[PDB]
Design an enzyme around this catalytic site. Sequence first.
Site, short mmCIF file in Angstrom:
data_model
loop_
_atom_site.label_atom_id
_atom_site.label_comp_id
_atom_site.label_asym_id
_atom_site.label_seq_id
_atom_site.Cartn_x
_atom_site.Cartn_y
_atom_site.Cartn_z
N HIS A 41 4.13 -1.35 2.97
CA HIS A 41 3.53 -0.47 2.35
C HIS A 41 3.83 -0.48 0.93
O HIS A 41 3.06 0.24 -0.10
CB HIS A 41 4.42 0.72 2.89
CG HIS A 41 4.21 1.93 2.40
ND1 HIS A 41 5.09 2.52 1.30
CD2 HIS A 41 3.09 3.03 2.16
CE1 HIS A 41 4.59 3.75 0.85
NE2 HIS A 41 3.49 4.16 1.41
N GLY A 143 12.50 6.67 -1.02
CA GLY A 143 13.35 5.49 -1.48
C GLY A 143 14.14 4.75 -0.49
O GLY A 143 14.52 3.56 -0.90
N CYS A 145 12.67 3.24 2.33
CA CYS A 145 11.86 2.26 2.96
C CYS A 145 12.53 0.76 2.68
O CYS A 145 12.98 0.59 1.73
CB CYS A 145 10.26 2.19 2.34
SG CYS A 145 9.40 3.50 2.66
#
EC number: 3.4.19.12
Lengths: 301, 301
Positions: A41, A143, A145
């Site tokens: 991503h 944040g 991830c």
Amino acid sequence: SGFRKMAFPSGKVEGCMVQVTCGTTTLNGLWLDDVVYCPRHVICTSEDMLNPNYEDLLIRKSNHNFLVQAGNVQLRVIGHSMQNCVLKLKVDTANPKTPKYKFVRIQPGQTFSVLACYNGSPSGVYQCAMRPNFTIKGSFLNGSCGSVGFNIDYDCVSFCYMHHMELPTGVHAGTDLEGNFYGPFVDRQTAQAAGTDTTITVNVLAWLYAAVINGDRWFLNRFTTTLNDFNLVAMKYNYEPLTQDHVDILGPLSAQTGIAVLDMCASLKELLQNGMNGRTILGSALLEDEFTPFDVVRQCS
Amino acid sequence: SGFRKMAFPSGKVEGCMVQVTCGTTTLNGLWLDDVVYCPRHVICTSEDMLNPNYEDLLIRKSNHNFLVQAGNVQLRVIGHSMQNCVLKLKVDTANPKTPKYKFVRIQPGQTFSVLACYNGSPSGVYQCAMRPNFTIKGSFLNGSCGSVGFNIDYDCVSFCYMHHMELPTGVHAGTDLEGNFYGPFVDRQTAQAAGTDTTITVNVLAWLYAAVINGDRWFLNRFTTTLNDFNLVAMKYNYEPLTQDHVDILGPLSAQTGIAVLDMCASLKELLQNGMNGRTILGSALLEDEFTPFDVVRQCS
Ligand SMILES: [Br-]
């Protein structure tokens, strides 16, 4: 004595966390030997979210588009590739803090420790279970991830989870470290939602054994039940079926306490049918299903 | 989203844990600069337990009686001294992994992370609160003496707890890192027992705010109460008094949610008087009091 949701010490993983930036997107990566693993991503723009073609997005990137920072040291990206839903960024420097490690995909019902991280900096550590519906009930903010889940056996870190996204019910979905999603979830914008969940029966029994080891005995009874009859009650209360393998796995705890598994099953049946009548077990007023038999043995005498 | 009992990352503390042996007693120590701190109980024999005179026991010891091991490296003890209920063992080697640190005594109602350790090796990490009665509801087995509790602010580890013993109710007592016991407990064999405890009201309110931030709103109501009237109900249910300073501390959470503190107090009063009617808050069927306002802000948006 005592029984807590206990995570593994996080030091070995802390030394592997890095920050990965591509464009205006920053998230966390895992630096092991000379590779940094992160969610693919990171190459998306908020515009691309609907139906990104990641193979196209990645072809359009260069090594220099990836800023990787290990604390105050920048790591030079010398190669990139996609593996399923993760990116593998080859860097010029091997991590000197790389622990002995494995990438291991877990089963629903298993637990693991989560090192929640922001901008490459670890923030906290907690225990999670993989739900029957392949979500986790984590604690993650924007944040997070790329934060990772893991277990430790002896000196070896078994990485089992990399965090990707939050579903509408507030629960969390991610991948194994090979980039394969747990459950029927995708890294693109859809109406996807957690499926129906169930309670992890073997774990509830393990936790009852923990309670007995710790002096909570009020829920015990003289009765025993059959596996078949118990599974009839389990189905009615949205509990997973109990198998003979589960019974065998509970062997050591049954032996330590002198309480046969099918005897403990009779107690669980009663608790399901009557509740707790205002009492608690190990400080809980609910039946707790996020401790495995291993977790109990690890923490109890 | 999500809300978990979340500990601080333990790496900085893991690099400080060592094994201390004197006689046949082994426990954990904390190695910071060129000093190892450990419970003075390490110089006791199971015979000395009734009423040891530690000043006498210590005079009879020599540096060479203390075996200190940092992993596979033996540390040479070059000096020893007692500070209250801890020992300070001066060693020939400063710990190269010493983080920036402070020794800070906490208040009842505050939380901290515990790194449970055995034979100098960290085993797990979990969050604890210091109870109003100065015990902690830990998870500790034989060999856990000397395990430490801490908080982290930025890069600095504030050590607040060193574990000593388990009381008859299964709860735990220990010292600050200056060797002063939390609560009316002593490191000798007596019938000492945890005193009566109360629920940490400010923390319960903080956790209700966390629930609202996370979408649990069913317990809210249109009512507001006075501080005086709420404290009348608090006393009846064995809750600590709520002070104006508590109300001020809850300011930021009240502002984020738009729910005045005394409005939330009306919800807590209702919950105390009626229970939950089979519902849950943040996955709990009880009112949870081991999250501080700071813990909530740290984890919530
Ligand atoms: Br509960």
